Amino acid sequence: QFDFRASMHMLTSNLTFTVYSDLLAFVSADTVEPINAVAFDNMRIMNEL
Amino acid sequence: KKIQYGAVASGEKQTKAANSIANLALIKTVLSRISNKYSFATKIIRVDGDDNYAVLQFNTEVTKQMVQDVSN
């Protein structure tokens, strides 16, 4: 039987989101000058003349 | 008819090596006025008479808005 007073339900959610997908489209990276580029140690790669 | 014409035409001797100087001095002045709106690093400029190209390398990725507003 369809009871109207016992079948009402209060559905709760949020008001406002803003959903993003591509997160690395916000950063803006850049390389240092390639003659001064350091390896895992302190010294630079391709240093010997 | 005798028409005044103070400009540069072909058929001279220097017109293959002095037209290539006037391009590399004109496209160097335009790429210095466009760098007030963007930040790049000019990789190559190559001139052949009056047809040339220049490869600009940007910081962030190139989008559809940075192509329409560099051309303008």
PDB file of C-alpha atoms in Angstrom:
ATOM      1  CA  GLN A   1       0.000   0.000   0.000  1.00  0.00           C
ATOM      2  CA  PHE A   2       1.155   3.529  -0.832  1.00  0.00           C
ATOM      3  CA  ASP A   3       1.445   5.528   2.388  1.00  0.00           C
ATOM      4  CA  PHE A   4       2.239   9.136   1.531  1.00  0.00           C
ATOM      5  CA  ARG A   5       3.259  10.154   5.057  1.00  0.00           C
ATOM      6  CA  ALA A   6       5.781   7.309   5.441  1.00  0.00           C
ATOM      7  CA  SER A   7       7.425   7.392   2.004  1.00  0.00           C
ATOM      8  CA  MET A   8       8.832  10.934   1.995  1.00  0.00           C
ATOM      9  CA  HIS A   9      12.617  11.143   2.278  1.00  0.00           C
ATOM     10  CA  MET A  10      14.936  14.145   2.567  1.00  0.00           C
ATOM     11  CA  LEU A  11      17.796  13.713   0.094  1.00  0.00           C
ATOM     12  CA  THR A  12      20.943  15.572   1.153  1.00  0.00           C
ATOM     13  CA  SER A  13      23.803  16.669  -1.095  1.00  0.00           C
ATOM     14  CA  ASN A  14      26.013  19.706  -1.668  1.00  0.00           C
ATOM     15  CA  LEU A  15      25.284  23.000  -3.404  1.00  0.00           C
ATOM     16  CA  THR A  16      28.234  23.731  -5.679  1.00  0.00           C
ATOM     17  CA  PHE A  17      31.284  21.856  -6.952  1.00  0.00           C
ATOM     18  CA  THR A  18      33.712  22.583  -9.763  1.00  0.00           C
ATOM     19  CA  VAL A  19      35.216  19.354 -11.097  1.00  0.00           C
ATOM     20  CA  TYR A  20      38.586  19.400 -12.877  1.00  0.00           C
ATOM     21  CA  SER A  21      40.205  16.578 -14.846  1.00  0.00           C
ATOM     22  CA  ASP A  22      43.666  17.528 -16.189  1.00  0.00           C
ATOM     23  CA  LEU A  23      45.585  18.678 -13.136  1.00  0.00           C
ATOM     24  CA  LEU A  24      48.958  19.311 -14.807  1.00  0.00           C
ATOM     25  CA  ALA A  25      47.413  21.902 -17.137  1.00  0.00           C
ATOM     26  CA  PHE A  26      47.856  24.467 -14.346  1.00  0.00           C
ATOM     27  CA  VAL A  27      51.610  24.242 -13.728  1.00  0.00           C
ATOM     28  CA  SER A  28      54.074  25.912 -16.097  1.00  0.00           C
ATOM     29  CA  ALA A  29      57.507  24.323 -15.910  1.00  0.00           C
ATOM     30  CA  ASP A  30      60.811  25.358 -17.448  1.00  0.00           C
ATOM     31  CA  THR A  31      64.313  23.933 -17.843  1.00  0.00           C
ATOM     32  CA  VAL A  32      67.515  25.546 -16.551  1.00  0.00           C
ATOM     33  CA  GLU A  33      70.324  26.325 -19.029  1.00  0.00           C
ATOM     34  CA  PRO A  34      71.467  22.893 -20.289  1.00  0.00           C
ATOM     35  CA  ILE A  35      75.193  23.591 -19.958  1.00  0.00           C
ATOM     36  CA  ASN A  36      74.628  23.803 -16.165  1.00  0.00           C
ATOM     37  CA  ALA A  37      72.612  20.676 -15.386  1.00  0.00           C
ATOM     38  CA  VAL A  38      73.622  18.582 -12.401  1.00  0.00           C
ATOM     39  CA  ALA A  39      73.563  14.801 -12.001  1.00  0.00           C
ATOM     40  CA  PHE A  40      72.636  12.841  -8.858  1.00  0.00           C
ATOM     41  CA  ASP A  41      75.895  14.067  -7.308  1.00  0.00           C
ATOM     42  CA  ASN A  42      76.908  17.725  -7.128  1.00  0.00           C
ATOM     43  CA  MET A  43      78.797  17.974 -10.422  1.00  0.00           C
ATOM     44  CA  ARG A  44      77.303  18.608 -13.845  1.00  0.00           C
ATOM     45  CA  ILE A  45      76.839  16.134 -16.680  1.00  0.00           C
ATOM     46  CA  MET A  46      79.118  16.545 -19.721  1.00  0.00           C
ATOM     47  CA  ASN A  47      81.721  18.705 -17.993  1.00  0.00           C
ATOM     48  CA  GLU A  48      84.982  17.337 -19.406  1.00  0.00           C
ATOM     49  CA  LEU A  49      86.319  19.346 -22.343  1.00  0.00           C
TER      50      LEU A  49
ATOM     51  CA  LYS B   1      56.058  57.546 -68.094  1.00  0.00           C
ATOM     52  CA  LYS B   2      58.676  58.476 -65.495  1.00  0.00           C
ATOM     53  CA  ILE B   3      57.593  57.292 -62.037  1.00  0.00           C
ATOM     54  CA  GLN B   4      59.489  58.022 -58.826  1.00  0.00           C
ATOM     55  CA  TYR B   5      60.522  54.776 -57.122  1.00  0.00           C
ATOM     56  CA  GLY B   6      62.887  54.949 -54.171  1.00  0.00           C
ATOM     57  CA  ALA B   7      62.404  51.327 -53.118  1.00  0.00           C
ATOM     58  CA  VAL B   8      64.245  48.033 -53.689  1.00  0.00           C
ATOM     59  CA  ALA B   9      63.641  45.873 -56.745  1.00  0.00           C
ATOM     60  CA  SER B  10      65.414  42.782 -58.017  1.00  0.00           C
ATOM     61  CA  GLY B  11      67.923  42.738 -60.856  1.00  0.00           C
ATOM     62  CA  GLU B  12      70.600  44.426 -58.751  1.00  0.00           C
ATOM     63  CA  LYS B  13      73.721  42.613 -57.576  1.00  0.00           C
ATOM     64  CA  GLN B  14      73.232  43.010 -53.819  1.00  0.00           C
ATOM     65  CA  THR B  15      69.534  42.072 -53.910  1.00  0.00           C
ATOM     66  CA  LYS B  16      70.180  38.471 -52.806  1.00  0.00           C
ATOM     67  CA  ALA B  17      72.461  39.315 -49.863  1.00  0.00           C
ATOM     68  CA  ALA B  18      71.127  42.705 -48.741  1.00  0.00           C
ATOM     69  CA  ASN B  19      67.477  41.662 -48.771  1.00  0.00           C
ATOM     70  CA  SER B  20      68.463  38.909 -46.334  1.00  0.00           C
ATOM     71  CA  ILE B  21      69.868  41.518 -43.941  1.00  0.00           C
ATOM     72  CA  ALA B  22      66.711  43.646 -44.001  1.00  0.00           C
ATOM     73  CA  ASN B  23      64.635  40.612 -42.986  1.00  0.00           C
ATOM     74  CA  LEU B  24      66.850  39.563 -40.073  1.00  0.00           C
ATOM     75  CA  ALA B  25      66.702  43.146 -38.791  1.00  0.00           C
ATOM     76  CA  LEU B  26      62.930  43.493 -39.237  1.00  0.00           C
ATOM     77  CA  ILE B  27      61.881  40.140 -37.756  1.00  0.00           C
ATOM     78  CA  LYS B  28      64.226  40.796 -34.829  1.00  0.00           C
ATOM     79  CA  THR B  29      62.352  44.027 -34.066  1.00  0.00           C
ATOM     80  CA  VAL B  30      58.897  42.429 -34.267  1.00  0.00           C
ATOM     81  CA  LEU B  31      59.848  39.532 -31.971  1.00  0.00           C
ATOM     82  CA  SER B  32      60.988  42.101 -29.396  1.00  0.00           C
ATOM     83  CA  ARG B  33      57.631  43.911 -29.417  1.00  0.00           C
ATOM     84  CA  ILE B  34      55.630  40.682 -29.070  1.00  0.00           C
ATOM     85  CA  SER B  35      57.597  39.717 -25.949  1.00  0.00           C
ATOM     86  CA  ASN B  36      55.696  42.263 -23.845  1.00  0.00           C
ATOM     87  CA  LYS B  37      52.652  39.966 -23.894  1.00  0.00           C
ATOM     88  CA  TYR B  38      54.354  36.549 -23.838  1.00  0.00           C
ATOM     89  CA  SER B  39      57.584  34.994 -22.586  1.00  0.00           C
ATOM     90  CA  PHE B  40      59.452  32.729 -24.985  1.00  0.00           C
ATOM     91  CA  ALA B  41      62.910  31.864 -26.298  1.00  0.00           C
ATOM     92  CA  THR B  42      63.553  32.133 -30.032  1.00  0.00           C
ATOM     93  CA  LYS B  43      65.080  28.869 -31.223  1.00  0.00           C
ATOM     94  CA  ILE B  44      65.843  29.621 -34.877  1.00  0.00           C
ATOM     95  CA  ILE B  45      65.306  32.407 -37.393  1.00  0.00           C
ATOM     96  CA  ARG B  46      65.988  31.631 -41.046  1.00  0.00           C
ATOM     97  CA  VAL B  47      65.567  34.101 -43.903  1.00  0.00           C
ATOM     98  CA  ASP B  48      65.578  33.443 -47.667  1.00  0.00           C
ATOM     99  CA  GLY B  49      64.875  36.672 -49.511  1.00  0.00           C
ATOM    100  CA  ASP B  50      61.395  37.621 -48.303  1.00  0.00           C
ATOM    101  CA  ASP B  51      60.069  34.245 -47.080  1.00  0.00           C
ATOM    102  CA  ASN B  52      61.143  33.207 -43.594  1.00  0.00           C
ATOM    103  CA  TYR B  53      60.119  31.441 -40.397  1.00  0.00           C
ATOM    104  CA  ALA B  54      60.878  31.609 -36.685  1.00  0.00           C
ATOM    105  CA  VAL B  55      60.402  28.921 -34.027  1.00  0.00           C
ATOM    106  CA  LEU B  56      59.352  30.268 -30.622  1.00  0.00           C
ATOM    107  CA  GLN B  57      59.537  27.984 -27.572  1.00  0.00           C
ATOM    108  CA  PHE B  58      57.100  28.750 -24.756  1.00  0.00           C
ATOM    109  CA  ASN B  59      57.015  27.934 -21.052  1.00  0.00           C
ATOM    110  CA  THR B  60      53.594  26.349 -20.676  1.00  0.00           C
ATOM    111  CA  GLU B  61      52.005  24.111 -23.288  1.00  0.00           C
ATOM    112  CA  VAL B  62      50.709  25.736 -26.467  1.00  0.00           C
ATOM    113  CA  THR B  63      46.926  26.092 -26.440  1.00  0.00           C
ATOM    114  CA  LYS B  64      44.333  27.361 -28.910  1.00  0.00           C
ATOM    115  CA  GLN B  65      44.340  30.811 -27.277  1.00  0.00           C
ATOM    116  CA  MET B  66      48.102  31.371 -27.504  1.00  0.00           C
ATOM    117  CA  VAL B  67      47.940  30.724 -31.261  1.00  0.00           C
ATOM    118  CA  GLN B  68      45.082  33.129 -32.012  1.00  0.00           C
ATOM    119  CA  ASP B  69      46.592  35.919 -29.883  1.00  0.00           C
ATOM    120  CA  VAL B  70      50.155  35.657 -31.183  1.00  0.00           C
ATOM    121  CA  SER B  71      48.886  35.884 -34.770  1.00  0.00           C
ATOM    122  CA  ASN B  72      46.975  39.043 -33.812  1.00  0.00           C
TER     123      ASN B  72
END
